[PDB]
C-alpha cells in the first residue's frame, strides 16, 4: 500500500453570511458558541460530513471510494459484507481469533470505504470489524471574533393538521450568524496512512474536498459559506521536523484597516502567512 510519505498540517479559513454553520442539538438550534467568550464553534464532525458528501458527489460510489457512514444505512449490515468477502463467520461480538484474519476484515473496510481510510472508524459491534484511528484529523473550527447569533421570526401561511383557531396560524424560527470567519486546524499522519493505505490520490481528493466543501452544501438554513484560504504545511520527512503549534502560528488573522464596526465581509480581515521553518514547505496556492 503506497501510503503518503510526508507529514502534513493545514489551516482552513471559511466564513458564513446570514446562516447557521452548525446548529446546537441541545440548545434548540442556536449556532454553537464558546460559552465564556462568544466565539463561534463548528465541530470537526460537521466538516468531515461535508467532506464525505463531496467525495460521494464527485466519485458517485466508484470502486474504493464508498462512504461508510452513508445515510440511514445500517452499519452491521456493512460489517457482514466485509465478513462475507473474507470467507469468515462473524462471532457474536468478537474479532476473528486469528490475527491475520482479524486484519483482513479491517483491511477490507479500509480499502473499500474512503472515509474509513481517511478519518477512521469504530466498528466494534455485534459484527466486530475492529477499529481504525484515521490518518486525517481535524480540530474544532473557532471564529476569529465573537459572533452574535440572531433568532429570526418566521410565519407560515399554511397549517399542518387543524389550526387551533379552527389571527396568526404559525410562527416559525430561524437562526443566523450575521457574519463569522472560522479557522480550522488539521493534521495528516504518515504513520497511520501506512496502516490504512491513505495514498497520494486520496490526499489530492481531500485537498479538493476542502477547497470545494461548501459549493454543494447550499440549503435554506446554511446561508452563504465558502472556503477562503487553505495553507498546507508539508514536512520533508515521515515524522515531521517542526511542532504543529509553531506552524499554525505562522498564519496570522487580524482585522484590516477597515476595523470600523462589526465585520461583515472577508475584506474586513487581513491574513498573512510567515516564513516556514527549514525542513517544512508551505504551499498556499489553494
Amino acid at each position: 500500500m503506497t501510503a503518503i510519505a510526508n507529514r502534513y498540517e493545514f489551516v482552513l479559513l471559511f466564513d458564513v453570511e446570514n446562516g447557521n454553520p452548525n446548529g446546537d442539538p441541545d440548545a434548540g438550534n442556536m449556532p454553537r458558541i464558546d460559552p465564556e467568550t462568544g466565539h463561534g464553534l463548528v465541530t470537526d464532525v460537521c466538516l468531515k460530513r461535508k467532506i464525505r458528501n463531496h467525495v460521494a458527489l464527485t466519485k458517485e460510489g466508484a470502486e474504493r471510494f464508498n462512504i461508510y457512514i452513508q445515510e440511514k444505512a445500517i452499519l452491521n449490515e456493512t460489517h457482514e459484507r466485509a465478513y462475507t468477502a473474507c470467507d469468515l463467520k462473524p462471532e457474536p461480538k468478537k474479532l476473528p481469533k486469528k490475527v491475520e484474519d482479524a486484519k483482513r476484515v479491517t483491511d477490507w473496510m479500509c480499502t473499500n470505504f474512503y472515509d474509513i481510510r481517511t478519518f477512521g472508524a469504530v466498528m466494534t459491534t455485534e459484527v466486530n470489524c475492529g477499529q481504525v484511528r484515521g490518518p486525517v484529523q481535524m480540530a474544532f473550527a473557532r471564529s476569529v471574533e465573537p459572533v452574535v447569533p440572531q433568532e429570526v421570526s418566521i410565519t407560515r401561511m399554511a397549517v399542518t393538521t387543524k389550526a387551533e383557531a379552527e389571527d396568526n396560524r404559525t410562527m416559525g424560527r430561524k437562526h443566523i450568524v450575521p457574519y463569522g470567519l472560522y479557522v480550522a486546524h488539521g493534521f495528516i499522519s504518515a504513520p497511520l496512512a501506512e496502516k490504512t493505505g491513505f495514498s497520494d490520490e486520496d490526499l489530492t481528493l481531500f485537498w479538493d474536498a476542502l477547497v470545494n466543501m461548501f459549493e454543494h452544501d447550499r440549503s435554506a438554513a446554511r446561508g452563504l459559506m465558502s472556503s477562503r484560504k487553505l495553507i498546507v504545511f508539508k514536512h520533508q520527512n515521515r515524522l515531521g521536523n517542526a511542532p504543529a503549534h509553531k506552524l499554525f502560528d505562522l498564519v496570522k488573522v487580524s482585522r484590516a484597516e477597515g476595523s470600523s464596526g462589526p465585520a461583515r465581509s472577508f475584506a474586513d480581515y487581513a491574513v498573512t502567512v510567515g516564513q516556514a521553518p527549514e525542513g517544512v514547505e508551505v504551499k498556499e496556492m489553494l
Partner: protein, 117 residues
C-alpha cells in the same frame, strides 16, 4: 423580600436588568412562543458587552408598546432599567463562572419581585 436593591454587584445588577427586560417583553407580547431568556441567555452571559444593547433596544420597543394604552404600568419598567443601569459604569467583556452564577441569582431574585401582587 430576598431581592437586595442596594447590593450593586455588576453581575447581580445585570441579572436584575435581564429579568426586568424579560418582564417587559412578556407584557408587551403575551403568548409569545419564547421568552427573551430562552433566546438570549447564552449570548447574554457569554458576551454581555455586545448583546445588552440589543436587548435594550428591544425593551425600549416593548415599553413604547406598553405606553400606548391604559394597561401602561411602561413607566415602572423604564424607571427600573434607568435605576439599575445607573449603578453600572461599563458592560463586562466577559464574566467568570461565579460571576455568571451571581448573574443568575440576581435574575431570579428580580423576577420574583416583579411577580409580587
Amino acid at each position: 423580600v430576598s431581592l437586595d436593591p442596594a447590593r450593586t454587584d455588576r453581575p447581580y445588577l445585570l441579572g436584575r436588568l435581564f429579568a426586568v427586560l424579560e418582564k417587559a417583553q412578556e407584557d408587551a407580547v403575551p403568548g409569545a412562543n419564547a421568552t427573551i431568556k430562552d433566546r438570549y441567555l447564552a449570548s447574554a452571559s457569554a458576551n454581555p458587552g455586545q448583546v445588552f444593547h440589543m436587548l435594550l433596544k428591544n425593551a425600549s420597543n416593548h415599553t413604547a408598546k406598553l405606553r400606548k394604552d391604559p394597561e401602561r404600568k411602561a413607566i415602572h419598567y423604564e424607571i427600573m432599567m434607568q435605576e439599575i443601569i445607573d449603578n453600572i459604569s461599563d458592560f463586562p467583556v466577559t464574566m467568570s463562572s461565579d460571576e455568571q452564577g451571581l448573574f443568575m441569582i440576581g435574575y431570579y431574585h428580580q423576577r420574583k419581585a416583579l411577580f409580587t401582587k
